[PDB]
Design a protein around this ligand. Structure first.
Ligand SMILES: Nc1nc2c(ncn2[C@@H]2O[C@H](COP(=O)(O)OP(=O)(O)OP(=O)(O)O)[C@@H](O)[C@H]2O)c(=O)[nH]1
Ligand SMILES: Nc1nc2c(ncn2[C@@H]2O[C@H](COP(=O)(O)OP(=O)(O)OP(=O)(O)O)[C@@H](O)[C@H]2O)c(=O)[nH]1
Ligand SMILES: [Mg+2]
Ligand SMILES: [Mg+2]
Lengths: 155, 431, 424
């Protein structure tokens, strides 16, 4: 199965092997047991070149897994600025909400990826979006006492 | 005839130091033990020989044992002004202290040194021909002062079943407190010592502190200051034993004169006058005995009943003036006795001028007095401790330290319940 | 209670450990050779507590650390036989330090430990400096703690544990490592000084006005803290003088043994601290969030217990007055059901560069703010299961993450419980 192989290659970062797999007709939008696409995996583990290739070959930029995680959610959480930008450029839903009610802005804020926060904001990130607990990104910056984040959340 | 002093923990040891220095000064005994006045035994039947034994070399040695689960404080004793006063076998130390934990002093650490201590006490008892009993000095709040003292008191009631045991207990105050759990230790030790002690003189550290600030003008009183004052009053109490008086001439007479009720064995001590180094009549000093500011324990005897009252004078004091002063007070203030007590005061006079330690904070005075009174008002002191105990115990705060050191959690409740009953005891008397 | 065995693990543990030894050596008049050139009896009175030569043990799976240590100013004073170094480096993997490479090197360390323990007249216990965000200091550190806890059950276990912040290290697995470590710390240590990198950065950036704080700037604060909190252990005194008396005074409930350290004044490196603080000022800094080495606000919780150490020439009378003042005027911030819960010590010997200073050791319920922060990040990461195969691939199970997460949430809840607790 070339789909499982593409999943492993996108996650491991074997750019060539990804190319070869896609050369034998590998399903770019294949899913694992939890609904993760090669794009989810490449975006999680910081594989920019692989992210770009996938997007240029019919990858759903707004594919969600079983937990409603989009690639943008994951890139924002792990803090891959390059990938966040590339994703947004290919039409990523900046205000996607996963199963926990979190948006990419929530996750970037929580992990203190300030540059990414700024990028998300400039692409129309909803500062008023609340998670399950009713907390927004600004609420997070206040409860955690993060003045740097609270500053950028109001620029 | 003979009395043996046992000093337990830092408080008991350092107060012991002050007491024995004072004793040597009162009896004309030099730091190396020589006494240019006494004759070799002899000559072993003098008054002061109740407290000092005699070497064939003329050396007068304190009938005392110093015990601490840590060497630092006692090491100062064997390396100080009076290093030659004690034989080194009288100074017993371990390595690890009780860490302000009753359970360590009584159970875990204390069991490893109790036999050595009892043995060193046996040697002293062996040098005695008519041992009356023991004077035990210790703190309430210390792990060793609480735990090991209660342990030793139990074992002493076993090995020396038929003899008196008196206490000088240091009651805790926040000004000099070094442990949060001091209320725990105080209640625990009061519980397990109660049936083993015949008479106990509590010294409230806050009372002594206040008297140093007010009457000695000391801004921040140190242990040395407190101990020299405490020493002066211990001296006033034990004087009748060291000088062959007519009142409280033996340890049994203390219980007889002060404790008509075994469980209620905590006389309040009041001392006057305390004067800084910068002359009061018999009437003036006698009146000061009924001023709560001069008490060694903070309480209000106006809100209580008397079971017994002893006045211990020393100095240029005429008996006729004493009785006159008493008749005044007995008919000027409001002194209330229980209906089952004589109501009359017991008077003892020691015609020597009070002694002070050279370089001390106390003025030499022509006459002084220590009143020992059994009043129900001292129950206030217990109430305060019990309040602090109850606040922490309700949350079981710091109880795990005791459980992890050979103590059952139930021993807390049992001890507190005994204290509750002791308060009830005082309540039934003062009504 | 005399000797303490010092252990420093990982990069952070070795940096703040080195700094600790530099600072207390200067305080005790010891030079990089080990010779005493001080001018006070008080300096050598309790020199046997930390010195034999530093009673220190130096550990890292990263061999290069060795060099950075001995290339330090006081790097020559350490016994060469107390260097236990691996050949790889865990690479921010708690499991590799805990189950894999660290488990392989741990016994070598224990041998050095035991060797130091044997020649101790009266061992107090142990003192570990480390970070919780990496693989060695966190993972292998907590292993050592369990191994020592089982070999020496009757000795005190003490740690200086530094908390990861995204403002210092942007490694996303640090909340994992910290949570897994705290799970071990809550169960295996008697007392833990929470040195928050979030707080150290905030203090350097916003108070000390450093635009770009380095590790040297953070460690300046850590060192001043460390000398402050060990003052009562290193100089003759009557309060919190040993590890056990401190713990007995500081820890009312066994799990609640994480301290929020603070001190004043907050100095910069090389700066000219002029016009020293008065006793009342030092006193009031106790409730100042800006002075806390843990990113928590004391005003947001209640103090269970506090230790206050004043250093320098000052009036014990005024210190007594100011400490009473700050307590009764802020009584609701001190838990009613622990009477007289603040203990104060005054040392005549002040730290270097300063004439007077105060150090505060707080057991405050507000420390939950720290754990709440880590947990939130841990939960953010753990729910998406990122990098989990790093840990399971070393032997761990996903259940250990769940158990650790759950336990830390329990700790937070317990702090909350006693914060709301009433004496009534
Ligand atoms: N009056 C007076 N009180 C003292 C003295 N030394 C200690 N204390 C008080 O005694 C209480 C308990 O302290 P310690 O007696 O030193 O404790 P310990 O008996 O040595 O027991 P551990 O040290 O816990 O093993 C504290 O509240 C002190 O205030 C002293 O020399 N004089
Ligand atoms: N305050 C402070 N924190 C440090 C310092 N050095 C490292 N850290 C922190 O420590 C955390 C992880 O680094 P270390 O614990 O030193 O890593 P390690 O223990 O050597 O483990 P490995 O890297 O896997 O070998 C990061 O969050 C850093 O911010 C330091 O010098 N000062
Ligand atoms: Mg002691
Ligand atoms: Mg390292």
């Amino acid at each position: 199965d070339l789909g499982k192989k593409l999943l492993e290659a996108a996650r491991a970062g074997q750019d060539d092997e990804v190319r070869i797999l896609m050369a034998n007709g590998a399903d770019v939008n294949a899913t694992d047991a939890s609904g993760l696409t090669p794009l989810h995996l490449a975006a999680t583990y910081g594989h920019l070149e692989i992210v770009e290739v996938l997007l240029k070959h019919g990858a759903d930029v707004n594919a969600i897994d079983i937990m409603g995680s989009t690639p943008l959610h994951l890139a924002a959480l792990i803090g891959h600025l390059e990938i966040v930008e590339v994703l947004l450029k290919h039409g990523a839903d900046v205000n996607a909400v996963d199963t926990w009610g979190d948006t990419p802005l929530h996750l970037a804020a929580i992990m203190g990826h300030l540059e990414i926060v700024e990028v998300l904001l400039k692409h129309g990130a909803d500062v008023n979006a609340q998670d399950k607990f009713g907390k927004t990104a600004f609420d997070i910056s206040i409860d955690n006492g993060n003045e740097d984040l609270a500053e950028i959340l109001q620029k | 005839r003979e009395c043996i002093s046992i000093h337990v923990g830092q408080a008991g040891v350092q107060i012991g130091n002050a007491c024995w220095e004072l004793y040597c000064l009162e009896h004309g005994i030099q730091p190396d033990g020589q006494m240019p006045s006494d004759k070799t035994i002899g000559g072993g039947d003098d008054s002061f020989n109740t407290f000092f034994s005699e070497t064939g070399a003329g050396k007068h040695v304190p009938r005392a044992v110093f015990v601490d689960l840590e060497p630092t404080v006692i090491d100062e004793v064997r390396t100080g002004t009076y290093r030659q006063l004690f034989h080194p076998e009288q100074l017993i130390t371990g390595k690890e202290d009780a860490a302000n934990n009753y359970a360590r002093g009584h159970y875990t650490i204390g069991k490893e040194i109790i036999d050595l201590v009892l043995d060193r006490i046996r040697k002293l008892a062996d040098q005695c021909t008519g041992l009356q009993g023991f004077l035990v000095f210790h703190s309430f709040g210390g792990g060793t002062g609480s735990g090991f003292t209660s342990l030793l008191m139990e074992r002493l009631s076993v090995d020396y079943g038929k003899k008196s045991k008196l206490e000088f207990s240091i009651y805790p105050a926040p000004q000099v407190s070094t442990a949060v759990v001091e209320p725990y230790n105080s209640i625990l030790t009061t519980h397990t010592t109660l049936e083993h002690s015949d008479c106990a003189f509590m010294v409230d550290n806050e009372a002594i502190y206040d008297i140093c600030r007010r009457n000695l003008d000391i801004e921040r009183p140190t242990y040395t200051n407190l101990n020299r004052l405490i020493s002066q009053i211990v001296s006033s109490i034990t004087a009748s034993l060291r000088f062959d008086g007519a009142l409280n001439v033996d340890l049994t007479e203390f219980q007889t004169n002060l404790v008509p009720y075994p469980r209620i064995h905590f006389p309040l001590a009041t001392y006057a006058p305390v004067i800084s180094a910068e002359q009061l009549s018999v009437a003036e000093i006698t009146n000061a005995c009924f001023e709560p500011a001069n008490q060694m324990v903070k309480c209000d005897p106006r809100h209580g009943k008397y079971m017994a009252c002893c006045l211990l004078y020393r100095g240029d004091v005429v008996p006729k003036d004493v009785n006159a002063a008493i008749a005044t007070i007995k008919t000027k203030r409001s002194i209330q006795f229980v209906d089952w007590c004589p109501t009359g005061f017991k008077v003892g006079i020691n015609y020597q001028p009070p002694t002070v330690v050279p370089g001390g904070d106390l003025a030499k005075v022509q006459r002084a007095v220590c009143m020992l009174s059994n009043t129900t008002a001292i129950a206030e002191a217990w109430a305060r401790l019990d309040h602090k105990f109850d606040l922490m115990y309700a949350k079981r705060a710091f109880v795990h330290w005791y459980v992890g050191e050979g103590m059952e959690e139930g021993e807390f409740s049992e001890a507190r319940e005994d204290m509750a009953a002791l308060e009830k005891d005082y309540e039934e008397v003062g009504v | 209670m005399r000797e303490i065995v010092h252990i420093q693990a990982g990069q952070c543990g070795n940096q703040i450990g080195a700094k600790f030894w530099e600072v207390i050596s200067d305080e005790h008049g010891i030079d990089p050779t080990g010779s005493y050139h001080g001018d006070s009896d008080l300096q050598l009175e309790r020199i046997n507590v930390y010195y034999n030569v530093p009673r220190a043990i130096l550990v890292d799976l990263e061999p290069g650390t060795m060099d950075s240590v001995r290339s330090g100013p006081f790097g020559q004073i350490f016994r060469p036989d107390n260097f236990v170094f691996g050949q790889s480096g865990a690479g921010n993997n708690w499991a590799k330090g805990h189950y894999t490479e660290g488990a392989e090197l741990v016994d070598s360390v224990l041998d050095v430990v035991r060797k130091e323990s044997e020649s101790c007249d009266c061992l107090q216990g142990f003192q570990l400096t480390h970070s919780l965000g990496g693989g060695t200091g966190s993972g292998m550190g907590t292993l050592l703690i369990s191994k020592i806890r089982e070999e020496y059950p009757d000795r005190i276990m003490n740690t200086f544990s530094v908390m990861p912040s995204p403002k210092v290290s942007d490694t996303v697995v640090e909340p994992y490592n910290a949570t897994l470590s705290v799970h071990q710390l809550v169960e295996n240590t008697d007392e833990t000084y929470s040195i928050d990198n979030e707080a150290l950065y905030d203090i350097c950036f916003r108070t000390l006005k450093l635009t770009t704080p380095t590790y040297g700037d953070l460690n300046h604060l850590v060192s001043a803290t460390m000398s402050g909190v060990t003052t009562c252990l290193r100089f003759p005194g009557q309060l919190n003088a040993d590890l056990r008396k401190l713990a007995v005074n500081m820890v009312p409930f066994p799990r609640l043994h994480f301290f929020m350290p603070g001190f004043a004044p907050l100095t910069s490196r090389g700066s000219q601290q002029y016009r020293a603080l008065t006793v009342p000022e030092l006193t009031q800094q106790m409730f100042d969030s800006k002075n806390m080495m843990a990113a928590c606000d004391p005003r947001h919780g209640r103090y269970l217990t506090v230790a206050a150490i004043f250093r320098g020439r000052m009036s014990m009378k005024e210190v007594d007055e100011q400490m009473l003042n700050v307590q009764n005027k802020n009584s609701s911030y001190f838990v009613e059901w622990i009477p007289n819960n603040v203990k104060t010590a005054v040392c005549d010997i002040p730290p270097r560069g300063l004439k007077m200073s105060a150090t505060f050791i707080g057991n405050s319920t507000a420390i939950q703010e720290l754990f709440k922060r880590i947990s939130e990040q841990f939960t953010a990461m753990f729910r998406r299961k990122a990098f989990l195969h790093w840990y399971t691939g070393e032997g761990m199970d996903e259940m250990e993450f769940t158990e650790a997460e759950s336990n830390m949430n329990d700790l937070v809840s317990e702090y909350q419980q006693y914060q709301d607790a009433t004496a009534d």
